[PDB]
DNA sequence: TGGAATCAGGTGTCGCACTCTG
DNA sequence: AACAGAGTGCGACACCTGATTCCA
């Protein structure tokens, strides 16, 4: 067993020891515990694990799909990627075999001069049917997808052309349609005996309230994993931290997404105009909306220029209208049979999502989100994308067919496009296509309710 | 064309419409009288009620035409709607030649309003109907837009 | 040793090639000794074929057998030549007399010399066999992506398909009848669908490690700058071919030159361009008379569609003509002939092209006329375009406003620009002042379908592309 | 004045012909 | 009476998107 490059695992261990804010004797015994399991980590780059579970079948498709063409690849990206593919062949997961199917491949540049290969499996995926404590710790799986062996009779689908020769995988391929669900199904009941754990695609999170229980659970989970046959990447994991990142959120002690809404005081005509535009939807179902809204129209009628005089009575009006909208007004019960439709929009400082059923008259539930400084310096598109991510999580949690109404246009373009112009896509569009692959969800653009200028939320 | 310093007066017209709370739209009109430097002499902002933006613009143009008939000396009109001016200038002889009907042989919308525009233009034929749209009239158009919003938001 | 029928004058070939180089006398002596001491590499006989030291390949993957067939009439002229060819093959043992279940026809094909190449028809056999879809043969990408240097060289393999054997149980399909005798192949038979795929896969596998190499089927191309590295890489290639068991012909090969032909395109010190032979062929054409000849002429013209900025607009009436007439007869007019003369004259004034860099961002410049649209490509800091593109507007696109025309041209150019990018950032120069206002464009003004509009707007958020406004060369 | 049924038309899949390179 | 690859075009159906038009 010889790799090509060996990572500085000792330095990462030292960094983890210092980064974890525990007692010094706690640190030393934790270091001893980590050291006693030295074979745990993949000190070799692209080191792959193994599973002894029976191989899975993934060629459940009934109609034969057509092959796809390939285009030339950059000379600069060739050396490193060739070393990677050679190592993968050496691991035995890849073999040289001749098959009917070919899959387009192309590289993308990493932050450094290195390149990363990606495989476009849209054609294949088209025709394959599917089926809180104070102490925190997070572990992750390094290329766990390459742990599930594939049946021999189903190997021919994943072949692709590199250096003029076909190559065939033996484990679950990256970016495949049903692969993440299958991997999650095995990993979740791999630990069905230990409560309090939380697994998502690749990361695994545990929470404890003491130190001894934390040590005991860590030792137990490590033994279970070593029995299973998986390997962990120390670089991307962290533990024993009061704050941690997971599911795109930051976790404090003992949530972030709320239901209060509320708005700070207006200062300009633009803010009041935007607020009126935002609340213009409410007239569809609120009978006494006109009486409450008349003071706002009176205020805008008399006012001139950008100077305004909004007394505390206007504050009482807006607070009352918010309470009336939110408390129990027309909030109907959800329908299981009806497909769920969600409409979302983003503000320069916050965002708002709404849920209906079959285009129902009344909202089902509300959502909100506050932008921290980290994303406050981001592009608007990134803000709206992360809000859409959070909204999709909530919607699938409350799910059944799902529809989304967003200012995004690229989503619907990617969802439906004829074959002759497939070509390639960006580094994040594949991550979102991971959702876009499943036809149970649809995306739409309507250009409704612009909110370029609005007051932020309260403190 | 002759400079603005020769005509008796210039009229600045603008209309806006906004979605309303079982009421579809609320529309206001703003028209200012100027007599020539630039001196916008006086102002009129009027709401209409439940109609689209085009109804507001056409009501504004008849308002301007009737006050121009109240005004002595050839005058000019400027608005934010080039479509109406182009259509009238291109189809007026046909417009009162075919009996106030379109190319589809159907009475086009705003029948009485179009009749008023036509008779006002024909009785006072020395009037200028133009539309420029960054120039001098930008400020006048901005205040007229503000006036139209003020009219629309009145109720 | 080996004794074929016709002995070839190898010394004459070596003298001709060494005399045809641009090297000096000492360099010529070095190359002469290099070629001499690797004398085993080249063929010394007619129909000389090699052998490969690899495990065999099995093509017998079919499930149900087809029905054998018989031979139809044979051309009289080639009969002694084909008989000699078959006898020579028998001498080398490539073809063996043996009766099998299957039988396949024979068909001679004329060759540049008095000889005839051997080709066979496998219709039912190809119908009943699964296909290998490994795509590793794209001529256009190779000719648009190769690196150009001062001293160029190429090598062409000969009789390559005859050097890769087959498994013992899979040979029975290759059976065929000759003069009442049944014969079977030993190696990959030419005319078989998977044979080119296997051959190209093997050949590209050989030359992985050698830097700056372009490989296509039976041809290897490369250019370098100085004599020392060129000789080093050439001798390394010769050694790898020697261990590979392949064989090389002088006549089809040439090395150490300044201008050379490749895939029908002449590469020179300035860049790639057309050859004299194709110019002669196009200059010797006449007025078409039938639909078949018309389609052929237009295909020859379409072959070189990327050597002139304004190709598409002139050829359009000719394309419209074919739909007008029915069957073979075509209604010709003098104006069409005028168009033909104009096209051939424009081709006679064609200019050469350039290569595409892999280290610098690509640039595209686009413009629109009331009837057509023009697209050109460039590298950063360069002035001579890589290739030209032109689009003709259809009847539906005629009603579009000028912004719609510019935008549809934008899409129809970036559709291939994204392919040509090869991961590099893309900068666009257009006569449009801004794009945020384009997003701000209201709906009452536009007329085209919203389905086109959303596709057009999709390009705004691509992180890999940008835009720039420049007021240069306007038209209307 | 506005609102929704019927209907003519653009976009997409798949078929055909021809060329060249080998 | 041949294949693989590439390039371009044209042509007959399918399916839906938008406009015309009648009616409240």
Author numbering:
A (entry chain B): 97 to 227, 243 to 365, 371 to 376, 378 to 516, 519 to 578
B (entry chain C): 585 to 605, 608 to 622, 625 to 721, 728 to 749
C (entry chain A): 96 to 571
What do the authors say?
To this aim, we used cryo-EM and obtained a 4.8-Å-resolution reconstruction of full-length MFV PR-RT in complex with a longer dsDNA comprising 22 bp and a 2-nt overhang at the 5′ end of the template strand (substrate 3) (see Materials and Methods for the sequence). The crystal structure of the PR-RT ΔRH–dsDNA complex was fitted into this cryo-EM reconstruction. The reconstruction corresponded well with the dimeric structure of the POL-connection portion of PR-RT ΔRH in complex with dsDNA. The cryo-EM data confirmed that the full-length MFV PR-RT forms dimers upon dsDNA binding. In the cryo-EM reconstruction, we did not observe any density for the protease domains, which indicates that they are more mobile than implied by the crystal structures. However, a density that corresponded to one of the RH domains was observed. The reconstruction does not clearly show which dimer subunit contributes this RH domain, but the C terminus of the connection domain of subunit A is located closer to the N terminus of this RH domain, so it is a more likely candidate. Interestingly, the RH domain interacts with the thumb subdomain of subunit B, which likely stabilizes the position of the RH domain. Moreover, the RH domain is in the vicinity of the dsDNA substrate, and charged residues Lys692, Lys694, Lys697, and His698 located in the basic protrusion are predicted to form contacts with the nucleic acid. In particular, the 22-bp dsDNA helix in the cryo-EM reconstruction shows only a very small bend of the DNA duplex.
Reverse transcriptases (RTs) use their DNA polymerase and RNase H activities to catalyze the conversion of single-stranded RNA to double-stranded DNA (dsDNA), a crucial process for the replication of retroviruses. Foamy viruses (FVs) have many characteristics that set them apart from OVs, including differences in the proliferation cycle and a different domain structure of the mature RT, which, in addition to POL and RH, harbors the N-terminal protease (PR) domain (PR-RT). Reverse transcriptases have two activities: DNA polymerase (POL) synthesizes DNA on DNA or RNA templates, whereas RNase H (RH) degrades the RNA strand of RNA/DNA hybrid intermediates. The structural and biophysical experiments showed that MFV PR-RT is a monomer upon binding to RNA/DNA and a dimer when it interacts with dsDNA.
